[PDB]
Design a protein around this ligand. Structure first.
Ligand SMILES: Cc1cn([C@H]2C[C@H](O)[C@@H](COP(=O)(O)OP(=O)(O)O[C@@H]3C[C@H](N)[C@@H](O)[C@@H](C)O3)O2)c(=O)[nH]c1=O
Ligand SMILES: Nc1ncnc2c1ncn2[C@@H]1O[C@H](CSCC[C@H](N)C(=O)O)[C@@H](O)[C@H]1O
Ligand SMILES: [Zn+2]
Length: 404
């Protein structure tokens, strides 16, 4: 398997087996046939980039009915509005600024930019969520960002002061093409800023559900630094973020144009000291993944034997990994509750557990809810205080299997 960043050899360290598309929710009457692929994760020998060993073709994952709506979380809405105001105050000052967002989804970030009157363009190849962004008055192209479409925007719109990507750069195995795109499109003094699930958090929390078809890369400061350097850029800042289970926001600039913050060296040294990306570390993680599987299925089967009812909360893409790697179906978790209309009245991928609206999670409550949207715990449990007050309990599997 050749590394997508540098062409080095990739060594597997975790095999999560056959998996379905994580974001395909079937109607109950649909033929039980899904696309499957082998989900496994390796580390490049040369650049230390951790990445999947099989690419799902982009058109199978991202298209007209892609179901994830970013704006469905109040924490994430505030998180991106804050980010946008931060760019408006720093990188987008001065005359006729231009920001391009890769993966704008329903416009969660760009709405703030558009309300500031700033020129912008979102790339969103998933046309149904693109339309939700356009309804907010955001300018969006229903295209993948890559070298050619970047060139096209550079031709018609001129250079961008900021190119931003949240939870999208790690989805893209053709990252070199994206980088060439960024090189064509970014202002000489601009920044390419992206934030994605962080390898250090996944390792520390054993959050293996962060690994599924759409998550190609599990970035670290170490791998991102190498990737930037190889493509003509430089990692010039890093910021840790609590969202989505733990992320890092990386800022890249053209090489030598800005001086790296002390934060970059500090995080690099912490990764090296902790041996984050050493194969033995990544294998110990893989062994902990198996332990969490075994304890989670033991618990779920015991709850069944003791006549306790169990549901899931949040029809996350992440959960496809949990239910298929663990073999959890509707006989152990009867329904999954979710606020996304396009996921409701459908079945989860591979495991086929029915998804019902969150409004249906109500008195009489089940005994236990398996929290798939664990990265949204605070937001979710704040809205579901009555469940817990009535004696309903949460089952979490990050960072360990526990009930509370
Ligand atoms: C906050 C909240 C979420 N939900 C539902 C909405 C979503 O269907 C789900 C939460 O999904 P998530 O944890 O935001 O994201 P996913 O794991 O599904 O992954 C998606 C798809 C991307 N590839 C991934 O990187 C991230 C950005 O979003 O949980 C609720 O039902 N109640 C809630 O109160
Ligand atoms: N090459 C590419 N260019 C632009 N967007 C892409 C892409 N490949 C996937 N996407 C979009 O990337 C998104 C990832 S989901 C992340 C959405 C949002 N930025 C958030 O952080 O919540 C999807 O909307 C998907 O359609
Ligand atoms: Zn490599």
């Amino acid at each position: 398997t050749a590394c997508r960043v540098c062409g080095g050899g990739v060594q597997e360290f975790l095999d999560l087996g056959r998996q379905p598309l994580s974001d395909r929710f079937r109607k109950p009457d649909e033929l039980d046939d899904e696309f499957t692929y082998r989900l496994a994760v390796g580390r490049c020998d040369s650049c230390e980039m951790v990445q999947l060993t099989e690419e799902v073709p982009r058109d199978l994952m991202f298209h007209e009915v892609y179901p994830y709506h970013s704006s469905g979380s109040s924490v994430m809405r505030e998180h991106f509005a804050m980010l946008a105001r931060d760019f408006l105050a720093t990188e987008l000052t001065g005359p006729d600024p231009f920001i391009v967002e890769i993966g704008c989804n329903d416009g969660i970030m760009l709405r703030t930019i558009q309300e500031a009157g700033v020129r912008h363009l979102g790339f969103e190849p998933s046309s149904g969520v693109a339309a939700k962004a356009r309804e907010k008055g955001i300018r969006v192209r229903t295209d993948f960002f890559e070298k050619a479409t970047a060139d096209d925007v550079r031709r018609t719109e001129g250079p961008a002061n900021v190119i931003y990507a949240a939870n999208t750069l790690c989805h893209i195995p053709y990252v070199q093409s994206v980088l060439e795109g960024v090189d064509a499109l970014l202002a000489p003094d601009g920044v390419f800023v992206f934030e994605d699930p962080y390898l250090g958090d996944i390792v520390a929390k054993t959050s293996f559900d962060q690994i599924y078809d759409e998550h190609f890369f599990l970035f670290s400061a170490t791998s991102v630094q190498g990737m930037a350097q190889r493509c003509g850029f430089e990692l010039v800042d890093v910021q840790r973020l609590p969202v989505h289970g733990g992320e890092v926001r990386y800022t890249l600039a053209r090489q030598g144009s800005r001086t790296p913050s002390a934060a970059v060296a500090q995080l690099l040294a912490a990764e090296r000291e902790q041996e984050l990306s050493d194969m033995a570390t990544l294998r110990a993680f893989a062994g902990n993944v198996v332990k969490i599987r075994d304890e989670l299925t033991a618990l779920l089967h015991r709850l069944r034997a003791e006549g306790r009812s169990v549901v899931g909360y949040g029809a996350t893409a992440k959960s496809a990994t949990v239910t298929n790697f663990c073999g959890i179906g509707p006989d152990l978790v009867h329904s999954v509750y979710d606020t996304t209309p396009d996921k409701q009245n459908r079945l989860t991928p591979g495991a086929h557990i029915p998804v019902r609206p969150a409004s249906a999670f109500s008195d009489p409550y089940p005994d236990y809810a398996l929290l798939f949207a664990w990265n949204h715990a605070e937001e979710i449990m704040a809205k579901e205080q009555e469940f817990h007050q009535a004696g309903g309990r949460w089952i979490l599997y990050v960072p360990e299997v526990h009930i509370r």
